[PDB]
Write a protein that binds this ligand. Sequence first.
Ligand SMILES: *[C@@H]1O[C@H](CO)[C@@H](O)[C@H](O)[C@H]1NC(C)=O
Ligand SMILES: *[C@@H]1O[C@H](CO)[C@@H](O)[C@H](O)[C@H]1NC(C)=O
Ligand SMILES: *[C@@H]1O[C@H](CO)[C@@H](O)[C@H](O)[C@H]1NC(C)=O
Ligand SMILES: *[C@@H]1O[C@H](CO)[C@@H](O)[C@H](O)[C@H]1NC(C)=O
Ligand SMILES: *[C@@H]1O[C@H](CO)[C@@H](O)[C@H](O)[C@H]1NC(C)=O
Lengths: 285, 364, 50
Amino acid sequence: QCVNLTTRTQLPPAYTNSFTRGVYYPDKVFRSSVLHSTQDLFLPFFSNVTWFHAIHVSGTNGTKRFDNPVLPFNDGVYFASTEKSNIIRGWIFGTTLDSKTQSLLIVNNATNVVIKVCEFQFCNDPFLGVYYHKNNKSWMESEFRVYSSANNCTFEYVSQPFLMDLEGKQGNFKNLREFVFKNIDGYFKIYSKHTPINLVRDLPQGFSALEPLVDLPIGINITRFQTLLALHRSYLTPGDSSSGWTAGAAAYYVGYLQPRTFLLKYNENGTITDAVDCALDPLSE
Amino acid sequence: TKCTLKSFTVEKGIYQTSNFRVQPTESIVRFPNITNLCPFGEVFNATRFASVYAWNRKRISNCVADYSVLYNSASFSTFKCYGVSPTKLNDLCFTNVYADSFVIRGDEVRQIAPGQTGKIADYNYKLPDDFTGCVIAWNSNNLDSKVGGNYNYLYRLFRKSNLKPFERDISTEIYQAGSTPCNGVEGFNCYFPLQSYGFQPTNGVGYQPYRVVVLSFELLHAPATVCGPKKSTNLVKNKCVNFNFNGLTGTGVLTESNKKFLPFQQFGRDIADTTDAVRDPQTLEILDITPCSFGGVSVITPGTNTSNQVAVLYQGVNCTEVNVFQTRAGCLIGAEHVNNSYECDIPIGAGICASYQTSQSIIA
Amino acid sequence: GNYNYLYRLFRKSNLKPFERDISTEIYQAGSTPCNGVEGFNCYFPLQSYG
Ligand SMILES: *[C@@H]1O[C@H](CO)[C@@H](O)[C@H](O)[C@H]1NC(C)=O
Ligand SMILES: *[C@@H]1O[C@H](CO)[C@@H](O)[C@H](O)[C@H]1NC(C)=O
Ligand SMILES: *[C@@H]1O[C@H](CO)[C@@H](O)[C@H](O)[C@H]1NC(C)=O
Ligand SMILES: *[C@@H]1O[C@H](CO)[C@@H](O)[C@H](O)[C@H]1NC(C)=O
Ligand SMILES: *[C@@H]1O[C@H](CO)[C@@H](O)[C@H](O)[C@H]1NC(C)=O
């Protein structure tokens, strides 16, 4: 069912800077010790990226935030989830996000990958669910309330079963999962990358190239998308259905792409080391 | 040499006459391993089929469909294709394939065709206009036929009008063939379109059922996922041959390189956007595409007014791809290498000169 | 409809410019030796118009 979450602490949005990030391999060509100039949809260096987060402060009324709004999709999107737990699950795509047009559904709960393409019934807030206990003190999935319908699905990519941790460890973020979602006239190209981190509430500086991950030939019109997160509901926060929606620590960054030319330097083993924006400053030109 | 500079008498010197070019030997083609075979072995091979008005579709996408193992089976009755030839089917890539499952009776197999009318072709099914597809039929009396009366199948005897193209009317209500609606038991101004089909094991060929599967293709704007199987030859190394791995067509010598590509990187180019190394799809090995041996063919003549002997120079050849002198400028065939040293009469290259000395020959 | 007018519907390769083919050999469609019989994978290379 489509439950409407409430008792959320509203706050103005926050923006951060992308310190030379969002660079992916444009094509599947090996280049060694060369500087190639490619014109494609890249993330502009030092951009005003949007910063969403999800935390719950104890004490007073607090800052109980759970950010997952509908964001446009012009030519691409950058996604760098920085968190210590496994709150982030996946994303949804489509044009109207209802049962009137096709849509993409990528879920990564701790049972299998749930990449599907159908006409779902995505609610106004596709929650997830984890649950803690005292007799069997182990985190387990509790809810999968994302869609409430079924139609003529045109794709299905359930992967091998895996058992994640799904716990609620406390501390500094030590997992940086970067994603780049593209769509060039016939496909949905996903570029992923995972690098360690030891930050708290900021985006790290450095050059990390994102490796290609999939080339789904699902021809659809995507203009809007929405992120999916998990809300821990233990015994410490009881109440009604949409009352105990604690989220722990979680923060993902968004960012759009635009047609730009980059100068990529390839190492002798064939990996990208640094890049030039070519339209950021006269020295770059 | 005479034909080059439009004359029958050439002077002393070295003249460029033609270009040496090693021709390719084979046509090596290496496509990835055939995997994700389309389930065309369960639509045909099915325990229980469905009625003619219950043509359940089994749409398939993102698969490798071999339309040849179906044609070359010698177990069908009428492999009638439309829009595309019955052969050369595994060379076209489609978006999605629509299958059909129904059991028509005898002559009704001739009704599923573009531009044909009949009982089934107007009541249960209705094939549209020109459309790329095919018909697959085979004997149904073998296992489907019940010994003692086969009445499990159903058939719409009469419908209100002609069916729409690729439509399924599940409207099972008692039609009024007579007068004001009966709205009750059949028999008086009451006609149920679905009564029965009827069969018998002691029947011939024209009065027996048949399992027909109408494969329907589509060329939608979506990328063609359903593709034909691509064959693959062997791999001969250390030989200038033509290669086509996944579209990168060209000629060259496929050697073994010590490079280390990335798991996702397949091809490899040079500073001037020229392919120099590729990854074989089947076996994850990195090759080295070196250009086929080529060069210029020069002719050294001391003049037709002195002699008719000539020496050929294959520039940029290792004398293993053509007296044979291996110089730093090419292979000089037709001249002897002397240990003496004289002034340069005809320049060859890299400090080598050729002349005509005495019993007469050309010395390098 | 007349049946004298015929046209070829099955040939191994394409016809070169200004070439006449007056042969009536059975076209082997599949990988089945015809050996001069008409039927499955072996069709007559001519057809009327009407
Ligand atoms: C751009 O960056 C500044 C400084 O971080 C921030 O105040 C502003 O909200 C950002 N975005 C907009 C809406 O201009
Ligand atoms: C390239 O890879 C080799 C081993 O694969 C490694 O020893 C070398 O340090 C790498 N080069 C660099 C600088 O990344
Ligand atoms: C169907 O069954 C027959 C007999 O086992 C087999 O020869 C054939 O390969 C199977 N597949 C199809 C659909 O032809
Ligand atoms: C392709 O098949 C061969 C033979 O079974 C096997 O050795 C090779 O590893 C396979 N490669 C891929 C890409 O699966
Ligand atoms: C090519 O020529 C060089 C110089 O004579 C020689 O060292 C080398 O072994 C030759 N290689 C082949 C392929 O014969």
